[PDB]
Design an enzyme around this catalytic site. Structure first.
Site, PDB file in Angstrom:
ATOM      1  N   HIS A 135      -6.815   5.118 -10.549  1.00  0.00           N
ATOM      2  CA  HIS A 135      -7.083   6.075  -9.484  1.00  0.00           C
ATOM      3  C   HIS A 135      -6.970   5.460  -8.092  1.00  0.00           C
ATOM      4  O   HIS A 135      -7.259   6.138  -7.097  1.00  0.00           O
ATOM      5  CB  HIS A 135      -8.459   6.722  -9.740  1.00  0.00           C
ATOM      6  CG  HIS A 135      -9.574   6.207  -8.884  1.00  0.00           C
ATOM      7  ND1 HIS A 135     -10.245   5.036  -9.163  1.00  0.00           N
ATOM      8  CD2 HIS A 135     -10.181   6.739  -7.799  1.00  0.00           C
ATOM      9  CE1 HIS A 135     -11.194   4.851  -8.262  1.00  0.00           C
ATOM     10  NE2 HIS A 135     -11.173   5.868  -7.421  1.00  0.00           N
ATOM     11  N   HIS A 136      -6.480   4.226  -7.991  1.00  0.00           N
ATOM     12  CA  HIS A 136      -6.360   3.538  -6.715  1.00  0.00           C
ATOM     13  C   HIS A 136      -4.939   3.486  -6.165  1.00  0.00           C
ATOM     14  O   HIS A 136      -4.771   3.297  -4.955  1.00  0.00           O
ATOM     15  CB  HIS A 136      -6.870   2.103  -6.842  1.00  0.00           C
ATOM     16  CG  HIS A 136      -8.273   1.990  -7.350  1.00  0.00           C
ATOM     17  ND1 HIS A 136      -8.569   1.651  -8.652  1.00  0.00           N
ATOM     18  CD2 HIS A 136      -9.462   2.135  -6.719  1.00  0.00           C
ATOM     19  CE1 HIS A 136      -9.880   1.613  -8.808  1.00  0.00           C
ATOM     20  NE2 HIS A 136     -10.445   1.899  -7.648  1.00  0.00           N
ATOM     21  N   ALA A 137      -3.919   3.634  -7.007  1.00  0.00           N
ATOM     22  CA  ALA A 137      -2.551   3.411  -6.564  1.00  0.00           C
ATOM     23  C   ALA A 137      -2.036   4.604  -5.760  1.00  0.00           C
ATOM     24  O   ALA A 137      -2.738   5.594  -5.534  1.00  0.00           O
ATOM     25  CB  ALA A 137      -1.646   3.123  -7.759  1.00  0.00           C
ATOM     26  N   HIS A 173     -14.955   1.312  -4.833  1.00  0.00           N
ATOM     27  CA  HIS A 173     -13.492   1.260  -4.820  1.00  0.00           C
ATOM     28  C   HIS A 173     -12.912   2.661  -5.039  1.00  0.00           C
ATOM     29  O   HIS A 173     -12.306   2.974  -6.064  1.00  0.00           O
ATOM     30  CB  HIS A 173     -12.950   0.256  -5.850  1.00  0.00           C
ATOM     31  CG  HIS A 173     -13.703  -1.038  -5.887  1.00  0.00           C
ATOM     32  ND1 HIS A 173     -14.726  -1.277  -6.780  1.00  0.00           N
ATOM     33  CD2 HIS A 173     -13.580  -2.164  -5.145  1.00  0.00           C
ATOM     34  CE1 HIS A 173     -15.203  -2.494  -6.585  1.00  0.00           C
ATOM     35  NE2 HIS A 173     -14.524  -3.054  -5.599  1.00  0.00           N
ATOM     36  N   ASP A 176      -8.345   5.938  -2.711  1.00  0.00           N
ATOM     37  CA  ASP A 176      -7.483   5.974  -1.533  1.00  0.00           C
ATOM     38  C   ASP A 176      -6.251   6.839  -1.780  1.00  0.00           C
ATOM     39  O   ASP A 176      -5.937   7.732  -0.985  1.00  0.00           O
ATOM     40  CB  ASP A 176      -7.059   4.558  -1.147  1.00  0.00           C
ATOM     41  CG  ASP A 176      -6.824   3.673  -2.354  1.00  0.00           C
ATOM     42  OD1 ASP A 176      -7.034   4.150  -3.488  1.00  0.00           O
ATOM     43  OD2 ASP A 176      -6.418   2.506  -2.171  1.00  0.00           O
TER      44      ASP A 176
END
Lengths: 391, 495, 290, 182
Positions: A135-137, A173, A176
């Site tokens: 879920h960050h890329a 985290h 983004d």
């Protein structure tokens, strides 16, 4: 609260991937969560599903063509010659490559699109995907210390049935890429809980709530180094209540990130089982369509404990603390109980600061008011059960 | 800021925000403005006008740019203002727990990949064995060996074998099956058997190490509590705190009271705190026996006089100097430390007497060893009485500090961080109450307290015109009911 | 009695690490017997480099005037810009008259391949004109950039500069709290320009930042005030022979778009507070009529 | 030797340096204004504001010499480490349709002023006569004086966040990662 049909998709190949030596973020937690679910006798109100690997031309729905083609061509034996695309997408520098990388991205995107399709056809009210959770890329990035954004792959796959989509990130985290992809459109609202301190995403603010049509429709809350359960309840219940009383979403994507548990490699939050359960429990209480996805968790014991607890309550059963014998019997704690003890670490957050955040958030939100698509082609994969009840 | 609006640059809303955040303590200026004032783009996540995108010919036909973004993106470097990344604060315990956990994960991952490979290979073996050799000789197959994963067998082959040998072994397997299958099955099963026979005790030693390290790692406040009390139990710190509390009720936003904290709801604390003080005084070695008796009787008399206790067995105002006030503040500090234990005693006691060990852990000798079995368990007795007997034993010196701290964090589930240094705080209380009779002014102050306690415009004159002019004074108010004390700090303002 | 050093299990992998037992066997029945520098001479940076022999420096694959992608290697051995002329009547005299309309720049164009390409650095008479601009470590624009108990608060509420206590501006409460109950304690960060105290709750901040750009207290002039539009970027400060100048002679409808040094080419004009008061009331009046 | 760079244009250079490095912004490739149009404006404006005793000869000679200087010395000193891959892709696009590599008509007046400022860095390290140096310094000072009046039209204060006429395109995360990588 109300009775719900919960669907859970797991691939056995997710477990047998190791990111590297000294690597906090890892996929082995998924297999032990699956084993705990299988050994806890949750199959009475559950169906098992197999995540088909993601098809190449439908995987490009989010990412670029060259990025996907590089991911299907990347391997440790040719990373040294892959220098340009290695440093361009932050691959191999902060996130090292390994055997079966493209397999992991394929099965994760397949599980996410499977959950989205099960949401679309409506046979199952809630879809649980622990195999995904990357879920960050971003579109052409592997930043945030992951490789894909399969939640945003699954969100738009459920846009056809669900016009208004609500996403919640509860772990450190934060997403983004998730809030970046759905910035300018009011169709998808991205809510994320994170700390102002520097993290793998690094982004997140109180004034970046949206531009264009998505203006005032992507709320981010900056938290502090560790929140008590009561303070997290007081910061979670009114915000989500106002969101569901104003946004009127038709779908919920819940990020079941274990990164915000009491003690891991990079996490800094202090929520116990009660604190982590209320996030899913509150957004379950409205009964609107739901998609539970989990990618966080740097310590296996804590993330497996909270995922087993979430799987327990989500089916409205009493999940006991005792762990049945499994392949990981000597793994979770000395006393071998399903309870993550909150550490004796200070509550930096302030009730006055929380009240100020509430007031500015309410004043912000008061002004507002491909050959295989939508398909659920898979296999049950429950003919053979690998239950190791013998020592 | 005032000029920028007059230069037709600063906007109304921006000037309004600057004004409302400049002031704000009082609102008459806000209404003064509102009488005649006539009344997103964050640090990161900015626009890209011509980013490399819009390529609708690689299978992305529709639903790829409707609600998606390629113009408003952001990087971790930009939001961090080009400063890199900062790691979480940790110590030796957390990093060693991470290391043991990670290597246990590594071992389990290798075992699990090996067993998956061996089960796929055994279905391959039986499905090629069940029929004749004519089709066994010609078994050309694509990569995958009939499964959905293409690189797992290559990975385990590379792991067990050498680097350059793994590729050719995989190539042979793919092109010439049913030849090297029995020998590779025997080698892989022998490796699995050796790995499992190692793990059957490696998991045991790993668990034994974790059983000692995990409870200490879960503590994030008690590891540095010793240095914190060394650097915070000072006179100047206490003066700073009381002055900071007293300046929060000043003008320009006084009050007859300076502190409404330090409540006294229960009088049972005095009983066992006096027992603890008595046994610590009995087990001291740096003091003389007549001085020990003097300290004991003075403490007993002060406790029976200040509070409503009757000493069964082992509006009024108080004006106090720095030493007495510090003694009282330390006394209420230990009072609150023990009240934190007492208030939550019920549910931790319930969960520790209703705690049941699971039955399957009783088979393979999964019991905790050499951690707490000498009698350190809190079951079968009151948690508070057991923890105070533990503190008395720790003061006695026959029980080491490490086991005391481990039992303290295990029994209350990391909710007794304030009792990590009870022996040191009561030692400090003892040696600073030694200072009361060491000089003569504090003895006279105590005598005045005894005089005015039993059944006051002269108190201020007596407490101001009897010492050197430049010294700190405190006022403690005691109420007849509810035992709610209050401390007022006034100095250099009554002359 | 953990006893970890007693048991080692040398027959298999050891200490997370793997030994050479897996590579110690070679019996298979499958085939059935048939110089360079860390820094750079162009941008003073570390990274991928190309090996060189004629020169003792190293250059990046993307730091050349004819840049070449690293995956496609050049044929043979690549040489630097001045390495071509390193092995090899003056040629300047004929080169000047060889071409027309470039005569005053003939010598300047002659020296193009005689030196290596490099990243751009501002000259030694540009950055120092503003004292706020200082050179960076790798070439950055340097303007303002450089979980325990309650003990954070005494280390922040006392600066030991004068033995006093700093009080926040939004609320006149230091809120140091008490040792017994430290939850009422609030962390205070001070400004890096005027040392103005500020609570972490009044301004929406949640952590202390000590790497990167220094935190700005929000009681100063905006740097990029936006009002098609206008992007004000100040006029900086000049310390070169007092070039900024001070000429107070009008202070009326000055319209000096800000940038005033208040007293009781580029020109930082001088202003007084009486003029600011007067034109504030003038603007208030003209807003009252409209 | 060192030419009198006006303090306004020094602020412009420092702002461009901040945009390139700290703000991570690069100039527009298809810039509406390049060196060709600024020199066209020069020849259209400065010719009729003065007499003609022959100064137009070496004026146009210096303009042509500058134009020739801006080609080869662009890839030598210019292109801050962020802009190297944009130069690479620009030359790749130029070579895609067999067009000659002519980078002068691509970059705007920011790079022109940057090349103007970098002259004393390499002018001193050669055998270059002072007689032409004095005239070149004087006429370059006239160039900066002309640019002063034109500084608002040519370097207008705008940012690449709400409009496309800010003579700047912001860096992307992949481009930022790969530009400072190699």
């Amino acid at each position: 609260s109300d009775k719900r049909r919960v669907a859970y998709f797991y691939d056995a190949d997710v477990g047998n991937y190791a990111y590297g030596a000294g690597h906090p973020m890892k996929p082995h937690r998924i297999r032990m969560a699956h084993s705990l679910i299988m050994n806890y006798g949750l199959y009475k109100k559950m169906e098992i599903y197999r995540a088909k690997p993601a098809t190449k031309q439908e995987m490009c729905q989010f990412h670029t063509d060259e990025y996907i083609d590089f991911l299907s061509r990347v391997t440790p034996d040719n990373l040294e010659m892959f220098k340009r695309e290695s440093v361009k997408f932050n691959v191999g520098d902060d996130c090292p490559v390994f055997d079966g990388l493209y397999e992991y991205c394929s099965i994760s995107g397949g599980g996410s699109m499977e959950g989205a399709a099960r949401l679309n056809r409506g046979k199952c009210d809630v879809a649980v995907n622990y195999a995904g959770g990357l879920h960050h890329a971003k579109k052409s990035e592997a930043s945030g210390f992951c490789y894909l954004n399969d939640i945003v792959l699954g969100i738009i796959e459920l846009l056809r049935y669900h016009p208004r989509v609500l996403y919640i990130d509860i772990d450190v985290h934060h997403g983004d890429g998730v809030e970046e992809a759905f910035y300018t459109t009011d169709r998808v609202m991205t809510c994320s809980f994170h700390k102002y301190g520097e993290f793998f995403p690094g982004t997140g603010e109180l004034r970046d709530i949206g531009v264009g049509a998505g203006k005032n429709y992507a709320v981010n809350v900056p938290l502090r180094d560790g929140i008590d359960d009561a303070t997290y309840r007081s910061v979670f219940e009114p915000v989500i209540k106002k969101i569901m009383e104003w946004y009127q979403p038709s779908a919920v994507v819940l990020q079941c990130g274990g990164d915000s548990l009491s003690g891991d490699r990079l996490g800094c939050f202090n929520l116990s089982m009660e604190g982590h359960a209320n996030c899913v429990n509150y957004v379950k209480s409205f009964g609107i369509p739901m998609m539970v996805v989990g990618g966080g968790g740097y310590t296996m014991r804590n993330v497996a404990r909270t995922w087993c607890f979430e799987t327990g309550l989500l089916n409205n059963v009493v999940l006991d603390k005792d762990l049945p014998y499994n392949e990981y019997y000597e793994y979770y704690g000395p006393d071998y109980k399903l309870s993550v003890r909150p550490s004796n670490m200070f509550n930096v957050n302030t009730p006055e600061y929380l009240d100020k955040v509430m007031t500015n958030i309410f004043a912000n939100l008061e002004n507002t008011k491909e050959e295989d698509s939508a398909e659920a082609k898979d296999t049950k994969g429950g003919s053979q059960y690998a239950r190791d009840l013998h020592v | 800021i005032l000029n920028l609006y007059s230069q037709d640059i600063l906007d109304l809303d921006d000037l309004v925000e600057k004004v409302d955040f400049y002031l704000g303590s009082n609102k008459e200026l806000f209404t003064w403005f509102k009488n005649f004032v006539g009344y997103a783009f964050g640090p990161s996540y900015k626009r890209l006008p011509k980013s490399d995108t819009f390529m609708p010919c690689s299978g992305r036909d529709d639903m790829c740019w409707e609600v998606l973004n390629d113009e408003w993106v952001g990087h971790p470097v930009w939001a961090s203002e080009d400063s890199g990344f900062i790691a979480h604060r940790k110590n030796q315990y957390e990093e060693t727990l991470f290391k043991i956990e990670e290597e246990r994960h590594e071992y389990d991952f290798y075992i699990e990949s090996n067993l998956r490979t061996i089960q796929c290979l055994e279905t391959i073996v039986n499905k090629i064995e069940n029929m004749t050799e004519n089709e066994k000789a010609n078994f050309k197959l694509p990569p995958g060996l009939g499964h959905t994963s293409m690189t797992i067998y290559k990975k385990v082959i590379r792991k067990v074998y050498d680097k350059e040998r793994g590729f050719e072994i995989i190539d042979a397997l793919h092109e010439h099956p049913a030849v090297t299958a029995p020998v590779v099955l025997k080698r892989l099963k022998q490796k699995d058997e050796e790995w499992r026979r190692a793990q059957r005790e490696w998991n045991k030693v790993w668990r034994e190490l974790e059983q000692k390290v995990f409870f200490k790692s879960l503590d994030h406040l008690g590891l540095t509590f010793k240095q914190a009390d060394k650097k915070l139990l000072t006179t100047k710190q206490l003066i700073s705190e009381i002055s900071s509390i007293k300046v929060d009720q000043t003008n320009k936003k006084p009050k007859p009271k300076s502190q409404l904290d330090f409540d006294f709801p229960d009088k049972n604390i005095f009983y066992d705190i006096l027992c603890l003080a008595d046994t610590f005084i009995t087990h001291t070695t740096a003091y003389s026996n007549p001085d020990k008796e003097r300290l004991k009787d003075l403490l007993k008399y002060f406790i029976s006089l200040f509070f409503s206790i009757s000493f069964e067995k082992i509006i009024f105002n108080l004006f106090a100097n720095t030493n007495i006030y510090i003694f009282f503040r330390h006394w209420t500090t230990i009072y609150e430390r023990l009240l934190e234990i007492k208030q939550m005693n019920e549910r931790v006691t319930k969960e520790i007497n209703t705690r049941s060990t699971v039955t399957f852990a009783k088979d393979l000798d999964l019991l905790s060893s050499q951690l707490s079995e000498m009698g350190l368990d809190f079951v079968g007795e009151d948690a508070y009485k057991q923890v105070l007997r533990l503190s008395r034993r720790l003061i006695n010196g026959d029980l080491e500090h490490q086991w005391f701290e481990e039992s303290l964090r295990q029994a209350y589930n990391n909710k007794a961080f304030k009792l990590y240094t009870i022996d040191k705080v009561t030692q400090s209380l003892v040696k600073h109450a030694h200072t009361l009779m060491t000089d003569a002014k504090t003895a006279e102050i105590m005598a005045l307290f005894v005089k005015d306690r039993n059944a006051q415009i002269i108190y201020r004159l007596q407490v101001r015109s009897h010492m050197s002019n430049t010294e700190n004074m405190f006022r403690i108010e005691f109420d007849k009911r509810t035992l709610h004390v209050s401390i007022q700090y006034i100095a250099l303002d009554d002359l | 009695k953990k006893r970890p050093k007693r048991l080692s299990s040398q027959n298999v992998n050891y200490d997370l690490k793997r030994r050479k037992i897996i590579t110690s066997e070679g019996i298979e029945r499958s085939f059935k017997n048939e110089e360079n520098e860390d820094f750079c001479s162009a941008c003073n940076q570390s990274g991928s480099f190309l090996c060189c022999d004629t020169c003792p420096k190293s250059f990046h694959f993307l730091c050349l005037d004819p840049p070449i992608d690293p995956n496609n290697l050049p044929k043979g051995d690549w040489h630097c810009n001045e390495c071509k002329f390193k092995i090899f009547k003056k040629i300047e005299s004929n080169f000047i008259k060889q071409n027309n309309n470039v005569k005053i720049f003939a010598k300047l164009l002659f020296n193009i391949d005689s030196h290596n390409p490099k990243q751009f650095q501002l000259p030694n008479y540009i950055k120092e004109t503003f004292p706020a601009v200082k050179t960076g470590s790798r070439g950055q624009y340097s303007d303002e950039n450089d979980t325990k108990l309650d003990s954070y608060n005494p280390d922040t509420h006392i600066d030991s500069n004068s033995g006093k206590f700093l009080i926040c501006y939004k609320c006149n409460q230091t809120r140091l709290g008490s040792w017994s109950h430290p939850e009422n304690s609030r962390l205070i960060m001070t400004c890096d320009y005027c040392q103005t105290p500020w609570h972490l709750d009044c301004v929406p901040r949640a952590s202390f930042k000590n790497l990167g750009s220094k935190w700005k207290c929000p009681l100063h002039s905006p740097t990029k005030v936006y009002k098609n539009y206008k992007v004000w970027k100040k006029q900086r400060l000049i310390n070169k022979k007092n070039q900024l100048y001070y000429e107070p002679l009008q202070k009326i409808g000055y319209q000096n778009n800000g940038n005033i040094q208040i007293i009781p080419d580029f020109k930082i004009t001088q202003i007084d507070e009486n003029s600011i008061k007067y034109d504030f009331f003038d603007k208030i009046y003209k807003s009252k009529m409209v | 030797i060192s030419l009198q760079i006006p303090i306004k244009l020094k602020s412009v250079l420092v702002d461009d340096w901040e945009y390139v490095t700290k703000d991570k912004k690069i100039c527009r490739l298809p810039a509406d204004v390049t060196v060709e149009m600024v020199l066209n404006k020069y020849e259209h404006e400065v010719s009729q504001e003065l007499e003609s005793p022959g100064s137009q000869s070496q004026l146009s000679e210096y303009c042509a010499g500058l134009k020739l200087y801006f080609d080869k010395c662009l890839g030598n000193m210019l292109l801050y480490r962020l802009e190297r891959l944009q130069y690479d892709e620009l030359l790749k696009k130029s070579s895609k349709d067999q067009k000659p590599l002519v980078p002068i008509r691509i970059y705007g007046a920011i790079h022109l002023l940057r090349l103007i400022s970098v002259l004393p860095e390499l002018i001193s390290s050669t055998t270059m006569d002072l007689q032409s140096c004095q005239l070149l310094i004087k006429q370059t000072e006239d160039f900066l004086v002309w640019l002063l009046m034109h500084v608002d039209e040519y370097f207008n204060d705008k940012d690449p966040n709400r409009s496309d006429d800010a003579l700047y395109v912001n860096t992307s995360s992949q481009y930022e990662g790969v530009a400072l990588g190699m």
